[PDB]
Ligand binder design. Structure first.
Ligand SMILES: [K+]
Ligand SMILES: [K+]
Ligand SMILES: [K+]
Ligand SMILES: [Mg+2]
Ligand SMILES: [Mg+2]
Ligand SMILES: [Mg+2]
Ligand SMILES: [Mg+2]
Ligand SMILES: [Mg+2]
Ligand SMILES: [Mg+2]
Ligand SMILES: [Mg+2]
Ligand SMILES: [Mg+2]
Ligand SMILES: [Mg+2]
Ligand SMILES: [Mg+2]
Ligand SMILES: [Mg+2]
Ligand SMILES: [Mg+2]
Ligand SMILES: [Mg+2]
Ligand SMILES: [Mg+2]
Ligand SMILES: [Mg+2]
Ligand SMILES: [Mg+2]
Ligand SMILES: [Mg+2]
Ligand SMILES: [Mg+2]
Ligand SMILES: [Mg+2]
Lengths: 175, 187, 125, 49, 135, 153
RNA sequence: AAUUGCCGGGAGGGAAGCGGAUGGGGGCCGGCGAUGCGCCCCGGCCGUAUGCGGAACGGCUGGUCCGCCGCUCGG
RNA sequence: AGGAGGGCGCGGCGGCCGCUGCAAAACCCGGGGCGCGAGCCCGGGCGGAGCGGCCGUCGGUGCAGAUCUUGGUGGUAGUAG
């Protein structure tokens, strides 16, 4: 509940802000109606907040899509705000993908991914426009299968889909 | 539900425009709507209101009243009436007066001009006196009408001098049994 | 052209006020008539009865009289009446009158194509 | 009619309308006549603010 | 007879005014006269109630403005110019005879808008519409 | 003349018509309903049987106060049926007209069936009857128009 | 129009019709819904100044257009 | 109950602006819309000769009732008989 504009300072931004007078900047057709021109908007929409239970290397259950119920490891949160996930593709067959923060559930099981390089993966990599994608996927699992093998039973856990069964109350389950 | 009368709306009525369709009067109203918006003058506000008034609410004014209301104050003072100036034969001396009115009779216009005065329209008074400075606002007799004589208390109640509505005048038209003691009573 | 209207058109009632009991009698027409009987359920506004029009149903002033294609309609009878929409072609559309013949409809439709005026019934007749 | 008039002088023309009344003998006896129509008490700073 | 007086006489009914859909909120009004840039029944745009007026009609585009001292003489009331140059050169002349002259500067935007529509209308007249403008 | 139904096979069909025929409309409507898709030869034998009191006509509407016979028990389980002779003879005459119209066209009489039959109300004719206390009442007939189309298929 | 026949469709446990709200089925509609807009190789027009002709605005200066030239080069 | 304002519709007259044998009026339609509404606009059909809108003004100017008038038509009913 912090008041950013609590004080009339405005100078911690532009300390050397004592500057001079501003300098203000044929149609070939006239539209017959006074339409205010559309310029690009100068508003910064304050990027989305990551859920505090999702941290790099934590496990996610997918809630919708063609991979509903897939137990998947979380890697990174992209600039657009979509989480970066991998299956990995060897165990459950889920490739590298970006998923919305909704449609996933953050479990309390974690994996260390510190020595894993996820840098070239970003929003531009998923631009709607494959052999090298197979290589990138191939070189990101072998860096992660071993850490999955480090924890007992984590491999068979990641290779199974989550499902609700008789008598299961999602609002009581710990995960 | 909120306890209010007629929902709190105003039930009194008033004129916000002239009922007539005279284009020259409509042009006067537009001019004086502008003046009361952007000069904030009490004088101009009265002129705009009277420009909406009906014929019986703008009684005619005679020369006798004008030459006596404007007695010594006829220099650097324009007489203003929203109505008609009529002539008066009962007076012989007519001083030089500046008079603005909606209408002049041709005898009143001749009487003013021959005396050295001027007859002005309200579009000319706006140029001379935009805020109505050095003016005399005048009204004719509102209640000097034969119709008003029949108004008030009924003719057959005590202390009433209201005119009855009689088809003729004479000894056989409403003078007995209610008008003297020899026939019944006298109200 | 491209409609200038951008506010969404909302209707408080896309439904007609059919005259009460016009279903019961063949000779009663559906055009609304305000009931005026002393015992009338519809006049007294009992629940479950026929609805009565009132000023609260009126539509937004900014979008009223706009057709579904976001234009306002103007009926023309010849080419000269169609020329009057050339400066308003973003807010007004042209409808050719019902009794205009096929020969004159061709002329109006041609001139409106030159002027970029939209004709709502240009494929008729 | 007497209740209607008093609630007009207190400006309580609608249900769940609220006003501040300063205390004196004149106002208190006005309030006693419209007691069944009203709930009142002594406000604190948090209420006033 | 000034323009304010003429406006009140011709405002109600007129040989050029077209009214439709009655006198409800449905009413739609237009003007048919030349030297009425937007064909709208209003004092600002009226070709009958104004001493100074501009007309932007095709023939080549004819621009016409009226002479103030020739009101009593209709045969010499209109000073007409016919232009067959490029759009910008025509747009410059319209701005010169209407705006820079102080001859109705309030009409310079309606006049340039109408010149655009008239020139565009002539453009498709010589070569038929090959694209529709719905975007 | 336009009938209410087109043959849909005009070359392979024949029609017959009758206007203002002096026979009760209500009786003829039931007779026409009883042979709606009937073959021409079965329709003729059925109508002759009706004339001979061997087959009844089922009365389904316009049936209030009609007796029960058991000759109509098939295709009308309650016995409501009758033998309208005038309405049967009038239809038989139309069937013979359409049959000869088909023979002129060369269509074979066999494999001919009624694809359309219709009874419509003609303008009523006026007569008079006398009642008690010097009163006069209407006494009306209800003639009908009959339309008939035979089709091969 | 009332009212009736036929054809096709739909519904029905001692009325039906009616208001509101959805759904199922049908019948309609394409201004029912877009395909253009800024940057670049091909097609194709002229400033500045001039002679001349008409006709403007303000209250004597300055203005636009057209057709013709003779320098000019950006559209 | 009652009053008033603003509008919708019908028929003339004085004016203005139009339409129509490349199809007017009237009528029909599970056609499409506009208006809170009175109503209006368009589409398809039929029909085959006239019609509309705006301003002003005028009137034999708006129907569900009146055991309302005249005409036509039902159920009763293929019944009473
Ligand atoms: K029986
Ligand atoms: K049926
Ligand atoms: K009239
Ligand atoms: Mg309220
Ligand atoms: Mg009230
Ligand atoms: Mg006494
Ligand atoms: Mg509606
Ligand atoms: Mg039509
Ligand atoms: Mg019996
Ligand atoms: Mg008898
Ligand atoms: Mg007898
Ligand atoms: Mg019918
Ligand atoms: Mg129907
Ligand atoms: Mg008419
Ligand atoms: Mg008459
Ligand atoms: Mg009458
Ligand atoms: Mg009637
Ligand atoms: Mg009534
Ligand atoms: Mg009766
Ligand atoms: Mg009768
Ligand atoms: Mg009867
Ligand atoms: Mg019997």
């Amino acid at each position: 509940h912090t008041y950013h504009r609590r004080g009339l300072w405005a100078i911690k931004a532009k300390h050397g802000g004592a500057l001079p007078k501003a300098e203000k900047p044929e149609p070939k057709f006239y539209p017959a109606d006074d339409v205010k021109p559309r310029t690009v908007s100068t508003r910064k929409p304050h990027p989305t907040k990551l859920r505090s239970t999702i941290t790099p290397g934590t496990v996610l259950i997918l809630l919708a899509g063609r991979y509903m119920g897939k137990r998947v490891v979380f890697l990174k949160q992209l600039q657009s705000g979509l989480l970066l996930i991998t299956g990995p593709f060897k165990i459950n067959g889920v490739p590298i993908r970006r998923v919305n923060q909704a449609y996933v559930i953050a479990t309390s099981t974690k994996v260390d991914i510190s020595k894993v390089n996820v840098q070239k993966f970003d929003d531009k990599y998923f631009a709607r426009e494959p052999d090298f994608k197979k290589d990138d996927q191939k070189v990101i699992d072998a860096e992660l299968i071993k850490a999955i093998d480090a924890v007992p039973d984590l491999k068979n856990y990641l290779g199974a889909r989550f499902s609700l069964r008789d008598g299961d109350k999602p609002h009581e389950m710990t995960f | 539900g909120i306890d209010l009368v007629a929902g709190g709306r105003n039930k009194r009525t008033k004129r916000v425009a002239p009922k007539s369709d005279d284009v020259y009067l409509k042009l006067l109203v537009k001019l004086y709507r502008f003046l009361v918006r952007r000069t904030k003058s009490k004088f101009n506000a009265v002129i705009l209101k009277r420009l909406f008034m009906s014929k019986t609410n703008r009684p005619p004014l005679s020369m006798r009243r004008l030459s006596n209301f404007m007695k010594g104050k006829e220099e650097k003072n324009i007489a203003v009436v929203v109505g008609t100036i009529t002539d008066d034969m009962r007076i012989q001396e007519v001083p030089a007066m500046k008079v603005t009115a909606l209408r002049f009779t041709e005898t009143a216009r001749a009487r003013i001009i021959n005396a050295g005065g001027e007859c002005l329209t309200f579009d000319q008074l706006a140029l001379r006196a935009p805020t109505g400075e050095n003016t005399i606002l005048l009204r004719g007799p509102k209640n000097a009408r034969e119709a008003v004589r029949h108004f008030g208390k009924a003719p057959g109640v005590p202390h009433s001098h209201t005119k009855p509505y009689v088809r003729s005048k004479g000894r056989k038209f409403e003078k007995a049994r209610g008008r003297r003691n020899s026939r019944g009573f006298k109200v | 052209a491209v409609p200038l209207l951008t506010r969404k058109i909302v209707k408080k009632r896309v439904k007609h006020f059919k005259r009460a009991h016009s279903d019961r009698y063949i000779g009663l027409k559906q055009s609304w008539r305000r009931p005026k009987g002393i015992d009338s359920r519809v006049r007294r506004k009992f629940k479950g009865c026929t609805l009565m029009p009132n000023i609260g149903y009126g539509s937004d002033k900014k979008t009223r009289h706009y057709l579904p294609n976001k234009f306002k309609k103007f009926v023309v009878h010849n080419v000269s009446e169609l020329e009057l929409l050339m400066m308003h072609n973003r807010t007004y559309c042209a409808e050719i009158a019902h009794n205009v013949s096929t020969k004159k409809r061709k002329d109006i439709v041609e001139r409106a194509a030159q002027l970029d005026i939209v004709v709502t019934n240009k494929l008729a007749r | 009619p007497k209740t209607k008039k008093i609630l007009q002088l207190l400006r309580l023309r609608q249900i769940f309308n609220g006003v501040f009344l300063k205390v004196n003998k004149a106002t208190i006896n006005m309030l006693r006549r419209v007691e069944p129509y009203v709930a009142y008490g002594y406000p604190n700073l948090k209420s006033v603010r | 007879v000034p323009g304010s007086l003429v406006w009140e006489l011709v405002k109600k009914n007129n040989c050029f005014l077209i009214k439709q859909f009655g006198n409800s909120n449905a009413k739609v009004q237009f003007s048919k006269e030349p030297n009425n840039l937007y064909n709208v029944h209003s004092y600002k745009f009226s070709g009958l109630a104004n001493s100074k007026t501009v007309a932007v009609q095709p023939s080549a585009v004819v621009l016409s403005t009226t002479k103030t001292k020739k009101q009593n003489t209709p045969a010499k009331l209109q000073h007409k110019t016919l232009m067959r140059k490029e759009f910008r050169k025509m747009a410059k002349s319209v701005k010169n005879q209407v705006c820079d002259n102080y001859y109705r500067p309030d009409l310079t935007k309606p006049a340039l808008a109408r010149l655009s529509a008239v020139y565009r209308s002539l453009q498709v007249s010589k070569s038929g519409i090959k694209k529709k403008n719905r975007q | 003349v336009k009938y209410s139904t087109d043959p849909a096979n005009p070359t392979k069909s024949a029609k017959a018509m009758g206007r203002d025929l002096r026979v009760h409309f209500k009786n003829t409507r039931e007779t026409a309903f009883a042979l709606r898709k009937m073959s021409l030869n079965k329709a003729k034998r059925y109508l002759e049987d009706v004339l001979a009191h061997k087959q009844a006509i089922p009365f389904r509407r316009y049936c209030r106060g009609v007796g029960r016979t058991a000759q109509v028990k098939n295709r009308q389980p309650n016995g409501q049926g009758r033998w309208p002779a005038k309405s049967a003879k009038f239809v038989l005459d139309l069937l013979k007209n359409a049959e000869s119209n088909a023979e002129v066209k060369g269509l074979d009489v066999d494999a001919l069936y009624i694809s359309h039959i219709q009874v419509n109300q003609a303008q009523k004719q006026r007569r008079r009857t006398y009642r008690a206390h010097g009163r006069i009442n209407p006494y009306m007939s209800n003639p009908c128009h009959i339309e008939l189309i035979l089709s091969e298929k």
